[PDB]
Amino acid sequence: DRGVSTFSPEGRLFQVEYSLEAIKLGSTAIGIATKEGVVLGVEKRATSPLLESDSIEKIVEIDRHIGCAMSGLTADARSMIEHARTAAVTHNLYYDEDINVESLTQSVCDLALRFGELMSRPFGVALLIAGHDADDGYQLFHAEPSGTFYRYNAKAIGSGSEGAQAELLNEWHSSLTLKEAELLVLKILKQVMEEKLDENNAQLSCITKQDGFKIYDNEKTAELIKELKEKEAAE
Amino acid sequence: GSRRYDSRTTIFSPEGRLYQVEYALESISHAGTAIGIMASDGIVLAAERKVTSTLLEQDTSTEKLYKLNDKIAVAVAGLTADAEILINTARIHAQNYLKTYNEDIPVEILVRRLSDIKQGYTQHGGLRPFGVSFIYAGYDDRYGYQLYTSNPSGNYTGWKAISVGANTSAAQTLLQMDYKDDMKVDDAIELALKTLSKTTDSSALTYDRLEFATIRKGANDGEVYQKIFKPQEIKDILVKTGIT
Amino acid sequence: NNYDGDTVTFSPTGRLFQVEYALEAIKQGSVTVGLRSNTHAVLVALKRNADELSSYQKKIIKCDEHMGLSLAGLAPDARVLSNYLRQQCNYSSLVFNRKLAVERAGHLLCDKAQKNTQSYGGRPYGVGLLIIGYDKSGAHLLEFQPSGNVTELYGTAIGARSQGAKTYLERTLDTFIKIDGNPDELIKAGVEAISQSLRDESLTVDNLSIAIVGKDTPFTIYDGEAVAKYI
Amino acid sequence: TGYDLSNSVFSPDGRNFQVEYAVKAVENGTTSIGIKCNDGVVFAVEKLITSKLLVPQKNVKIQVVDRHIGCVYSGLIPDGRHLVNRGREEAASFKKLYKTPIPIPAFADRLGQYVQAHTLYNSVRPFGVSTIFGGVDKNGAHLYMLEPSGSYWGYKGAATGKGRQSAKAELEKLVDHHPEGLSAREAVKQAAKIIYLAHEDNKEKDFELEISWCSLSETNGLHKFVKGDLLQEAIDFAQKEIN
Amino acid sequence: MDIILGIRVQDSVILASSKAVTRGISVLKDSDDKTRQLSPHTLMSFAGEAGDTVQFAEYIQANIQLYSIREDYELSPQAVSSFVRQELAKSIRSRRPYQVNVLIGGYDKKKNKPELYQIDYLGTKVELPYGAHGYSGFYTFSLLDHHYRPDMTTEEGLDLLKLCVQELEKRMPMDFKGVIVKIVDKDGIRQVDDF
Amino acid sequence: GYDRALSIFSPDGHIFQVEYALEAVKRGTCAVGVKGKNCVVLGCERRSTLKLQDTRITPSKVSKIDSHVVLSFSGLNADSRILIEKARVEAQSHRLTLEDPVTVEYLTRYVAGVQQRYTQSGGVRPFGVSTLIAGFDPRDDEPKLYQTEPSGIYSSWSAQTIGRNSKTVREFLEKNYDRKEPPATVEECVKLTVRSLLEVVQTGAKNIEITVVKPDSDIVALSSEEINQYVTQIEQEKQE
Amino acid sequence: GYDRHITIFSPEGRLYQVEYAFKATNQTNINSLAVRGKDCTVVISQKKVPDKLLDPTTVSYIFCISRTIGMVVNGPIPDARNAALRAKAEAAEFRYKYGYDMPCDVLAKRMANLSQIYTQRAYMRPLGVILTFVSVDEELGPSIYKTDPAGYYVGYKATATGPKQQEITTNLENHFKKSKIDHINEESWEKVVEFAITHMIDALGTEFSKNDLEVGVATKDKFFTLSAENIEERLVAIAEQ
Amino acid sequence: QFNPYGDNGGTILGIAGEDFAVLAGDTRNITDYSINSRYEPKVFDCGDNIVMSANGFAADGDALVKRFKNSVKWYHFDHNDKKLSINSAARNIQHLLYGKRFFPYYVHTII
Amino acid sequence: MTDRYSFSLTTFSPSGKLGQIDYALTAVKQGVTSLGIKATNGVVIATEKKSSSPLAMSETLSKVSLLTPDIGAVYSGMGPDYRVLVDKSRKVAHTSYKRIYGEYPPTKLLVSEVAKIMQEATQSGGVRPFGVSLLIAGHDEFNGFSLYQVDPSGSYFPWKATAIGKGSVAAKTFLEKRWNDELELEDAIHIALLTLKESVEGEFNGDTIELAIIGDENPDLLGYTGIPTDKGPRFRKLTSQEINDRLEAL
Ligand SMILES: [Cl-]
Ligand SMILES: [Mg+2]
Fold first, then answer.
1. Domain boundaries, chain G
2. Is H22's Cβ below 8 Å from some Cβ in A?
3. Number of Cα atoms under 13 Å in the Cβ half of residue D186
4. HSE-up (13 A, CA, CB side) for residue C69
5. Interface contact B4, partner G, CB < 8 A
6. CB B61 to CB I157 under 8 A?
7. Active-site residue flag, D1
8. Which residue of B has its CA nearest to D122?
9. CA nearest neighbour of G30 among G90, G77, G98, G66
10. Phi and psi dihedrals of F210, rounded to 5?
11. Which of B108, E54, G206, H69 has the fewest C-beta atoms lying within 10 Å of its C-beta?
12. Do the chains A and D touch each other, judged by at least 3 C-beta pairs below 8 angstroms?
């Protein structure tokens, strides 16, 4: 056939580029960083109404100060999360401190290109890693299967991403409040989702310095959806 | 590098089948027919030899029926050499179990083990699967008399009567017609031979062509006896049942 | 064509296509410039962003107090190679109490890259590196290609549109080599050199990345408002 | 067909096409030569000046093995370095066990067997270099040239790379005109000339001459680079002969 | 761990095992159960080196419980004892052997018979009408030699066991803090709470 | 060792070996899981191409992983044994180190993790198996029903079906299963599970298997005659 | 058609890679001959130094494997040297383990078994060489044993190898048909070398100078190769009768 | 028998003030009754405003300090030139020491 | 410098054929005829010494090989593959049997071990099957005399008499007419020489025919005296002269 680590004539790894196509098929995930916190939101996308939607875990805790949202082949993320959690806890054991969000992300991204003929293929999942540390404050990173990560003020990944990113382009400013960022994630998710957005097929979360990483209750998100509907009807 | 020459023996087809397993089963469909029939008071194993020559030394020959321990025997359909590899592994597993627990291995446990080995060759290692289907005839004190079959996929199932190898479709229809649950060993012997006599590709069924065995709980004082039939004894049972 | 499926295969004209395709990843990468005098050595890098919300990808990596590089191509491969350089610089210090010679650093990178081009299963590195350093024989600048070819130079550039900066340096050779004991003027010449490779975009405050090493100057990277002086 | 896609496959001819394709990479490279003289050997190489930005005398191509063996090669430069690295390991283990520095014929076979091993498997690529090497041992001077196939012979003069035919013709004249032999200092001058004459095949870009030598009288049997006045004397001699 | 006794009567096996856990100077506990249920009709008591005892007992328990799930069947007491013996016999030539002695009391549901196996840390197995490990047997075997009959009831077995425990409480130097007693019969395993 | 990357991405972002493993699941006999208010029922199809079978000794389709958790499956039978074995081992290892039996979610997560590992390891193909894992957590009376698949994704279901013609029985369950009021009793839950299988099975009672799992390790397999009574009652109500 | 690239059977029952390795054998265009005397075994081979820049002393296809055993190779020099180094290693190891000098025929067998492995195992290619081993064995006397890429080996009364082997073979065949003995009935090795050169001259139809030949001689307890001057003495004696 | 440990003597002293700290040590190095050196520095600046001394067997002391200095260097590389806090340095040293639990660094370490 | 052939080179084709085994059997068909005949008091195995050159000393090439003192082997197909199998067969007779039980293995079990080696070359990674069929004749105390054929697949069958290689179909027909259960060893040798004459083109004598027997114990060939139980090898290779003597009474 052909090597798994083969370069194309344009200078790209075939398998890495093909995994990026798998991530485009995944459900939407959006992250917005502010000075009051970082918000992470996802489309759950249950394949059937009998599937108990609260078991869809596409937003995940790495440590108290670091959260993570995923998009793509979400089964591939489990070992990445495991490595992230272990890296975070291990660094606290060795250094009696929280681990920097960038350093955590860099550790996750070091797994990415460990594939060949090590694992047999790249990961088929992109991660939004959101967190806070004392040095660089509230941060949002986009961790790809290429091994590259970019910091972002805001970022969308998954099937509605280019549409959502253009919307995040206009809407994001450096003075956003946390409440504003929550509504903005819900707004853009509702825009790019096939099904109608509610508290059962979409999930919010955030990370603040005081309270750390929290996945929102369905009752809490339901109120923010109702608040969104009213403010859009207001003009 | 080497990738160029790799057949990739452990992959799914677009339809979700294992190519090599399917092709191995095709191989096995040409092998000599083996029949197992389970009765209330015993099990029969009958099997048809493939290579009729007058110069084959039949009394010292064994291509179909093998002994795994005192309670369990197998009938083989496919590559004999492949079967012997598996047979020796099974013989060891039985003696490991006997050494560990000081009890003879239950039939199903032995069958599962062999079947798991076969399965492994379909899921990893890049090697071809074993081109073998077994009929296991055995006894233990839990389930009594048992018949199983395993095939190159590593799937195994239990049976009252079953065939493997050539003409199994025809053979299974005939067994399904004449088998009954209250049947006895002597009746099952007759059924096994009659089924082979009709499904055989040969002109006539003779003693020099058959391997035959019974597992009876009709030994002295409630023990279990494995009888691998000698050529003369196969000739006698052919005259008794009225085939020759 | 038929001879590009893996790195182990020569073509009928004696070419290694997988290595040449890795070389192509460098040309797609963002421009970076290297140049030196007798006293100092400078790296200037044009960093690339994904979009207006994203950060600009870091191009310069520190290897030791007296050595570092800039990258163009696959950033994860630069991380692997720079980490290897950090270890070799570190091994030289711990075992021999000796700062690793820049020339010897190049030789190590060449030999690491080579092993990936002759063995099956592996792939070539998909990145080019410009190593600067100040050692016991003064300032040095190296260019690393993932074929294995390493080259000691007065100045150079790699990445997209790098030919423009490379021509400028080829003219300026006699001027910038003489910029001794003046770090700001040497950086100016590097910033003026990288400007020849720009089209449409210009050098902004979070776009530009500069690094310098010299006689009494540890390898230090300048980003953000630290480079506003040179815009 | 398909016999040329995989290394170590015999074609119907009995040929290993991948090795023959490695030879094409060698033929594409710059010119390098070797001259055997009275009590030693001289090595020289053409270094193409791709740009004014190349630092003169810095990108050194000739490599020393142990203290008495010089190696030069044409083709894929990293492949040559890999081969020299191995050579150094072979020379080191030989001296570690047997005390004496590795003899040149002994050293030649060590490279020969290693290069030949890279024609035995499809999991590896042949070497994309021809290597000219040699030096002074207890039995005197030896000059060798080693091909991608693992093939090597001893030589009076050797040449490889893009200007090999030109060089080989010049070396053949020296063998004919000096049967009693050539001195070490003469061989340095002649090496310079031959690289300058062989440069007509690579005449687009200007070049930089690099010479080294081992000689029993001139270097005490150790490998040294030709530098300064002696290098300039050889350049002047070469420049005078082309005009 | 100190005293572990076993006695096989007509229709059951009774295991008595001391409650004390002593680490050198102090008695750290006086209510320790030195036993594990391997299967519903098979109980293993144990005594030996600290740590090794429980580690071994729980390891055996896990393996027998795994067997039970895989085959949907309870191994005979004989089979379990042979498995345990082999593990100990394997252990004795290891880098660091399990210093654990065990009694396995089981009711064979197939044969409708109680069975008591005594196995030491070397892997020395014996089936017995009554057994003990360590210094216990020095006092108790002479009693059991005198009083034991194969056709005894479970109540008679418990009375004979009280007479063993009284003798141990009179003549042994260590305060073993009494015994937990457990009965293994056709209905399974139960603990005699008042002894 | 054999290292070859069999599960790899294709230009459209698909892992064909994983998707072809799902086709093996589609071929497998139908399996269904329905959770009531205080129970979970696992129904399974038995193809009637195979008669002269010995049903005493033939591998049953529902497997106990521990005394409180069961696993059924659709797909390659031989592959399923490997997952069942690993799960059973992990169940006893969890009891040994945590001193508590596995939760149904934990056991599912483990099995799903094994399935995932076989989609990005060298030399191996994915499991041609999807599972339904059902039970009750220790000291908990809330029913649990999970589903896994070759890719390694897993999720919780009020009711679910897998295998051949699972599209049809999922259609049936999607209209007949009410979340606000699930099957209140064991009878109601078993009836709905049998009814759902009767859409596809197309034969009486030998082809249906039912296993009821209740809280506190109360697992029982129904017999032919017990199931045949449900079959009789369903069709007599249907004639109207 | 990948059955022609690696060592697996073709539908005809053939190993094409083995057959093509036999063709690589004649790539050098050199003919070799081996004959036996009473007390000796002589091997001669053509020597061709086409390039004037070559050091002719280093151009050789005869190898001193051990003190007793010599080996001439027909095939490319890299594979020849591969085989030579291994045969030396095997001969030395044999002596160490078993306490006596490795016999010629045992070494041939060992190298043939190694060659067989390359015909059966896919990752290893055959060597494109024919190895002719010569000695005066202490049990069997003067000995010629030849190995090829198929892993075949056999003893010889005399033998020839190369592009024009059939011409040399028939020439030798005819001589032994006359004499009716398995060897050259001659006391001194010098005259057995003269026989070998004469019967190569007759068979190939070409005259030889001292630099066109290469000679190896096995005697009891040593194998050695003749210098150009030792060959010249041999050529003078042939011409003088 | 070979004894891998030795005693190079010396004494060290750390005192923490309100907004400062001192780490003092004598400069004598000894074996048995012989003076090896009258000035062999024992207290080292390790970067990031941390001072360290590993007093006891000098070879194990030098080894440890050398490893910790290197640990500071790699902390900078791996975490974006972040300053290694004294509490983090302390925990890092615990792991360096405990890493050789069964063949210990024979030293009293103060930072 | 890696062995990357960890996968089978012999695989099932859509028709259920194992191609490489069939092709190996084709190679066996091209090979020179060899045969085996079992008598009441012995077994004979025979083949043609097809000399590749008249300069070659065909005595040095042994097509008929002693495996144990009471077991011999002959082949048809590829000679080098046979030679390495004989080496492995001799060794396995010691390692897996004699060093355990203190006696040589019986014929059937040694055959089983050879068969196993050949089967593994039919399934293991990066190898082709052996291109030979073996005929193994032997004696042991409890089974008596026996003759086995072993094929590239690893399959083996016991024979009263058989032939393999070039003219096997014709040879097997010839043996069917002549074989009975009352043959003495001399009668079987006579039939072996008659059968083999049909498949040989050129010279037919003791120098171009290789023939060995498994017969009576040969205490003269033992090499030592003083142990009554060791009575000597039943394997004996007939000399060039011993063959020519029987060719006069032919
Ligand atoms: Cl060998
Ligand atoms: Mg090969």
1. 1-241
2. no
3. 12
4. 29
5. yes
6. yes
7. no
8. B1
9. G77
10. -130, 135
11. G206
12. no
Scan residues 161-200 of F and list those with Cβ closer than 8 Å to B. Answer: none
Q: What is the resolution of this structure in A?
A: 2.9
Distance from CA of A82 to the nearest CA of H (A): 20
- Which range of residues forms the domain containing residue D212? 1-243
Judged by CB atoms closer than 8 Å, whether chains meet at B13 and F82 is answered as no
CB-based contacts of I195, cutoff 8 Å, min separation 6? I35, I37, I163, I171, I174, I175, I178
D1, D30, D119, D160: the catalytic one is D30
**Angle of helix I79-93 versus helix G104-120 axis, rounded to 10:** 100
Residues of I with Cβ-Cβ distance to B61 under 8 angstroms: 157-158
- The ligand with the least distance to the CA atom of G124 is 2
Measured torsion, CA atoms of residues I164, I169, I173, I174, in degrees rounded to the nearest 10: -60
How close does chain F come to E73, measured CA to CA in Å? 12
Q: Which domains, from first to last, does chain E contain?
A: 1-195 (3.60.20.10)
G82: nearest Cα among D23, I4, D151: D151
Q: How buried is D143 (Cβ within 10 angstroms: 0-12 exposed, 13-18 middle, 19+ buried)?
A: buried
DSSP I96: I
Taking an 8 Å cut-off on Cβ atoms, the answer to whether C126 and A11 are in contact is yes
Tell whether B60 lies on the interface with G, counting CB pairs under 8 A. no
**Complete DSSP assignment for A35-73:** SS-EEEEEE---SSTTB-GGG---EEEEETTEEEEEEES
> CATH assignment of I1-250?
3.60.20.10
- CATH number for the region F1-240 comes to 3.60.20.10
Q: 3-state DSSP call for residue A126?
A: strand
Write the class of the CATH domain B1-244: alpha beta
CB < 8 Å to A135, chain H? 80, 82
Residues with Cβ < 8 Å from B28, sequence gap 6 or more? Answer: B77, B78, B131, B132, B133, B151, B152, B164, B165, I16
Q: Do D123 and B4 count as a contact with CB atoms less than 8 A apart?
A: no
* Residue D123, SS3 per DSSP: coil
- The pair of structure tokens assigned to I229 is 């139980």
E75 touches chain B (CB under 8 A): yes
CB D213 within 8 A of CB D70: yes
F16 touches chain A (CB under 8 A): no
Which CATH number covers residue D18?
Answer: 3.60.20.10
From CA C141, how far away is CA C131, in angstroms rounded?
A: 6
Coil, strand, or helix at residue I139? strand
CATH 3.90.230.10 given to domain G1-241: no
First-last CA distance in chain A: 59
Domain count, chain D: 1
Q: CB–CB of F64/E69 below 8 Å?
A: yes
Chain A residues with beta carbon closer than 8 angstroms to that of C76: 109, 112-113, 146-148
Most C CBs within 10 A among D8, D48, D55, hence the mutation to make, goes to D55
Nearest ligand atom owner, CA of G127: 2
Does I touch F (3+ CB pairs < 8 Å)?
yes
| Pairwise CA distance, residues C28 & D76, whole Å | 24
Instruction: Give the C-alpha separation, I213 to C109, whole Å.
Output: 69
**Ligand index nearest the alpha carbon of residue I90:** 1
Superfamily assignment of A1-235 in CATH? Aminohydrolase, N-terminal nucleophile (Ntn) domain (3.60.20.10)
Domain ranges of chain B: 1-244
Every domain of chain A and the residues it spans? 1-235
Alpha carbon distance D142, C57 (integer Å)? 55
